[PDB]
Amino acid sequence: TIRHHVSDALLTAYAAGTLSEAFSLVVATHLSLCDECRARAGALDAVGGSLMEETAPVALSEGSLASVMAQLDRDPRAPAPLADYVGRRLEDVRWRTLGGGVRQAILPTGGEAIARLLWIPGGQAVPDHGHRGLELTLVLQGAFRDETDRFGAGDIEIADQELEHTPVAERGLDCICLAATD
Amino acid sequence: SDRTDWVALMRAIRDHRDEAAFAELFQHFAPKVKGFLMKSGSVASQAEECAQDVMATVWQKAHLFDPSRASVATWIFTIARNRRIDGLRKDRQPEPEDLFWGPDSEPDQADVYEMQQENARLGRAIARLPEAQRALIERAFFGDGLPLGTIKSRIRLALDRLRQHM
Ligand SMILES: [Zn+2]
Numbered sequence: 488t489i490r491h492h493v494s495d496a497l498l499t500a501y502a503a504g505t506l507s508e509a510f511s512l513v514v515a516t517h518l519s520l521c522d523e524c525r526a527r528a529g530a531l532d533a534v535g536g537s538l539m540e541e542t543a544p545v546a547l548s549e550g551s552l553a554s555v556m557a558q559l560d561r562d563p564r565a566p567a568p569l570a571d572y573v574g575r576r577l578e579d580v581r582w583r584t585l586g587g588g589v590r591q592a593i594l595p596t597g598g599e600a601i602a603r604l605l606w607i608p609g610g611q612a613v614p615d616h617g618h619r620g621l622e623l624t625l626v627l628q629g630a631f632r633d634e635t636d637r638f639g640a641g642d643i644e645i646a647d648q649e650l651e652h653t654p655v656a657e658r659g660l661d662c663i664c665l666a667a668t669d
Numbered sequence: 670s671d672r673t674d675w676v677a678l679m680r681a682i683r684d685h686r687d688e689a690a691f692a693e694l695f696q697h698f699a700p701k702v703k704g705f706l707m708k709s710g711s712v713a714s715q716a717e718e719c720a721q722d723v724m725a726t727v728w729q730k731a732h733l734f735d736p737s738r739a740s741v742a743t744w745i746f747t748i749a750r751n752r753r754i755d756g757l758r759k760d761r762q763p764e765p766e767d768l769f770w771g772p773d774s775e776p777d778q779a780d781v782y783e784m785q786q787e788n789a790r791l792g793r794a795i796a797r798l799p800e801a802q803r804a805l806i807e808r809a810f811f812g813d814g815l816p817l818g819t820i821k822s823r824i825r826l827a828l829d830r831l832r833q834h835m
Contacts, residue, residue: 501762503810504750508758519765522832526825529738530791530817535750535810536743537792544700545707547717552695555721559728561686568763597759 489521491642497623498524502531507598509667512568513623513643516665519567520625520641564627564640569665572596573604577627577663580604587611600669607631607662612655620669622646629662631655673697675741676785680775682731695724698742702749709811723748733769737776737827740788768831780827787820 493501493514500506501514518525562576572594573580580592590606607613609629623645630639631654638644646652656662671677672693681690703720707713726748734744751762770776794816795806806815 499809502750503813504752504754504762505813506757506762508763511758512763515763515765522825522828525765526821526828529743529824530821532739532747533743533788533791533820534795534806534815534817535746536740536788537795538807538810539701539705539746539749540740540742540792541796542701542705542708545704545713545716546700547703547720551699551717551721552692555695555724556688556692559688559691559725561688567765571763595759597755598757 489523489641491636491638491644492521492524492527493517493643494645495527497645498527498531502528502535507600507669508596509594509598509600509602510621510623510669512572512594512596512602513625513665513667516567516569516627517625517641517643564663569627572602577604582606586614589613600667602665602667605664605666607656607664609656609658609661612653613664615652615654617648617650617652618646618668619648621648622669623667625665627663627665629660630657631662631664632657676736676781679731679734679736679741682728683734684772691724691728694727694741698727698745699724701742702745705746706749708807719749719752722752732772733767735769735776735827735831737780737784737830738824740785743788768828768835770831770834774834776827776830780823780830784823784827787816787823791816791820 497510497514501511506514518528562570565573565577582590582592584590588608588611592604594602594604596602605613613631623643624638625643626638626640628640630637633644633652633654675694678690678693681687699720702723703716706716706719711719723745727745734741739747751764753761798806
């Protein structure tokens, strides 16, 4: 049961579309794993649709309708969009080897925020630093313990600069996550 | 006005590739999508470019529209904001997995009637905000306490239904 969601502020940014590709990637992968946050985004989208509908129209150049009508045609743990950044299954992505059994595979994105898949085996821990901005983590498999809480499959953590990081992954299965930093 | 019955017209496109219906939609939403994108800070020419593109997408992804989870204007807003934003992305805002009703079925008339109701309530609330809270809202959707509760609840509710069907 997902007990950790995307903050209202991140959901508002996602609904506004002002988010950087990386963060949008994590937020939306959660959204396709968590119906609760999916319903929240929806209410937020509703605000946009209303502002939309209540905006003074601006005429298009003549012929626009006619123009457009002419050109009209008559892995279960990596699913929302994440699947587009990774091939068939998670076992064969371009994995780098790092500090012991941790492995990471950077994902290609626009914007100035970075996304990557972290592979942390049971028992080891993700070494980490309190970033300058905001870090988003989404567990896709297994889980890991921050002390302030736990995070299992589908749960998302939102670190802030005020933080202290200490995460050790649960023993059992390997905890694979999706992270994004700015 | 049945020519204005957006939901109905979207079903027209979904099931019969009703081009008149599409024109009906376009003549209403295109100019709004344009004005909206300009308030967002786009240049007329680039707005009209996007407007047209958004409308073409409305046609292509017509089947993805679920009248029990959003109004047509919200769905369209969804397609306008997911456009390319250079400094933030290469192609489009990454969006969640597509949950749609297949051609075999459709959401309950009731769930739809209610979704549209709560939406109309949000619209109304939005409209009467004193000009200060109304700007707070706009600044968010343009650059940078509403009844979202009720709407959030229906979608949550409508979403569960969609799940049993699949
Ligand atoms: Zn959630």
